[PDB]
Amino acid sequence: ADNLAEFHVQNQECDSCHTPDGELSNDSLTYENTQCVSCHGTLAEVAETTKHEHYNAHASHFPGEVACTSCHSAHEKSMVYCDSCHSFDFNMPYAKKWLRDEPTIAELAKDKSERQAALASAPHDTVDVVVVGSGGAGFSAAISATDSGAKVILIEKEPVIGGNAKLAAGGMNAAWTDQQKAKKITDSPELMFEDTMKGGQNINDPALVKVLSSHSKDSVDWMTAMGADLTDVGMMGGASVNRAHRPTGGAGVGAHVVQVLYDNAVKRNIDLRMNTRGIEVLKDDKGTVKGILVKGMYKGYYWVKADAVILATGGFAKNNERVAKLDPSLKGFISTNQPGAVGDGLDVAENAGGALKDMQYIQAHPTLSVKGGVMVTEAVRGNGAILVNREGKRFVNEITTRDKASAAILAQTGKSAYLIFDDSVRKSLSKIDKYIGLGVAPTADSLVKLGKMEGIDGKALTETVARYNSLVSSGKDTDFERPNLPRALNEGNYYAIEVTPGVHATMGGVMIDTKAEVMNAKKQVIPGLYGAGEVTGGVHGANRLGGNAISDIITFGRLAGEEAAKYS
Ligand SMILES: Cc1cc2nc3c(=O)[nH]c(=O)nc-3n(C[C@H](O)[C@H](O)[C@@H](O)COP(=O)(O)OP(=O)(O)OC[C@H]3O[C@@H](n4cnc5c(N)ncnc54)[C@H](O)[C@@H]3O)c2cc1C
Ligand code: HEM
Ligand code: HEM
Ligand code: HEM
Ligand code: HEM
Ligand SMILES: O=C(O)/C=C/C(=O)O
Ligand code: NA
Binding positions for heme c 4? Predict the structure, then answer.
């Protein structure tokens, strides 16, 4: 057969997958995926039949309920979603090579005829607020507006939920929490504010950083009340004390937080629509929001009538063409992001009158795996690992800010470096076992053997770790001034991960005030329009601190939903 439907119709009727009249149920293909499951079982049941030692197409780190049609189309060949970041040996029936080529908002102006027909029709739905984006900020806004009495519709352009938020690892920053007190840590919102402004080179808007520090504990409390585990508290770069909260044992914070938000949305019966892209914010004759035009992949264009729209579409770090026009030093670099993080949300905000700010400030994460092409958490360094070059020496304070750490690594021989750690560091952070499972953390029982395996001077490496452990014992790094030295690298076996910088976060975006309202270039509010999360600018200034984006998306998403519900 040439496609999956052709295979099935040799022995089945059309109504085995379709509704009685044949129309597609909705853009999430709810009815159709329910029929796949009726014969094959749930995704976890299918996964029992497709196990590999270290990977499985049907049992991954993605949260929520991943629809079968995310990867299996019926009437045409289709792509494996995991191929956008990995290259596992798969043999999916009727597959084609991964390729993402989404039309821009400007190119969609070519659908003049279909769009005018949709806008001439009745609105498909009439609600109070529409939220665009199913990342951490969007789910937070949808839940808080619903809890404040508003009727919401939440839309997502991709086939799966979570955006970049589901990939987060290192933690969520907050001060002075009950969780910090239980681990004997002393902190304050004032200290988090001061670290944040200094880390951003004082470019941040101080009123928005005051919202970030002062609401941080309340956001950790709100997530914990909904069922999240934020009890493990570690250190990230540029922080005075440990404040990055994540699950017990050092597991990833992102997939966990997104799964909690999704379960809480399902409990409240929130209308969530996949494969549905927001295209154009609609405004009335007085300049206030009246609704939004959307494009469903399977059902086409339609509009929703509403008093408020909350844009929560994330950043644009996957789009290297746009990144290079703003910061040419990052042209041609690989990215840590999901395939849809290209900035179309910024285009929608500008078309509605919103102004942008700080667009030139873009962050490279210092440690992407050279072998796997995926981000390696900064929590590996925070829990104790060091960085060495090909000559086997340390060369930088490993917990400095990301701008300085990326530059340092690029200055070394081969433009890459190695994370080095032992079993004491491995057992303190369970996320490290995920890098061992991916095959990007080679190990040996001596540093001479490990240096030979990877191309690092072995004698120098051995001497480097001995000296570092001596610095840890005395309490002061006289070589690179690293201010926190948590563990000596001397238990069990040794591990190396080859790393280099990659494009990771865009600190600029739509201009918002402290109530999350979007403003134009004259600094006037656009009534009914809100923004929250990485789509906004002014919170992180010239360099974001690790742990501060998960904090931002919960705080500003929650505030935007409450403000939009009150606006009504
Ligand atoms: C690998 C990785 C690890 C990270 N680790 C951490 C961590 O440990 N700590 C931390 O502080 N931050 C971390 N970050 C940053 C953090 O995950 C991001 O800032 C993300 O949390 C921002 O969330 P968001 O809700 O604004 O956007 P996202 O989570 O990116 O979600 C936005 C959603 O909007 C959808 N969308 C876009 N345009 C449209 C449209 N027109 N119509 C409909 N839907 C649309 C996108 O497809 C996406 O699903 C990490 C980022 C990455 C990529
Ligand atoms: C979009 C919906 C569905 C998806 C994604 C899906 C998935 C698949 C795939 C990937 C195959 C393997 C094809 C090949 O070997 O070339 C398959 C085969 C098969 N499917 Fe489906 N399926 C769907 C709907 C259904 C339904 C509704 C039924 C039953 C009424 C069904 C019953 C079967 C059977 C009997 C086989 C042959 C192998 C076996 O006996 O398990 N499928 N399906
Ligand atoms: C001869 C039998 C069938 C007929 C006549 C038929 C008809 C159609 C049509 C006309 C569409 C597009 C509708 C639109 O654009 O609005 C469609 C899409 C679709 N059909 Fe079928 N269908 C048949 C069998 C099946 C089978 C056996 C399956 C599943 C195994 C299936 C699953 C789907 C799905 C998931 C879609 C959405 C797009 C895609 O994945 O290709 N159909 N079908
Ligand atoms: C419940 C939802 C789904 C069903 C019922 C389904 C069905 C199937 C079936 C019947 C097979 C063939 C297994 C065999 O050889 O015995 C298969 C293979 C495969 N499917 Fe799915 N699928 C689902 C969701 C997905 C999703 C979401 C993805 C991608 C993330 C995916 C990607 C693949 C791949 C890559 C293979 C080949 C696996 C390998 O080579 O190890 N499927 N699927
Ligand atoms: C359904 C699709 C996918 C599958 C089956 C898959 C599979 C895996 C596997 C087997 C690992 C090693 C650790 C583990 O066993 O969980 C891993 C790690 C990782 N994957 Fe994926 N992956 C998928 C999609 C993606 C995509 C699209 C991205 C990036 C946007 C991504 C980003 C990462 C990262 C950053 C890691 C490092 C470890 C961690 O952060 O937990 N994955 N993945
Ligand atoms: O886990 C990391 O390294 C990412 C943290 C962040 O981008 O804030
Ligand atoms: Na931003």
Answer: 61, 82, 85-86, 431
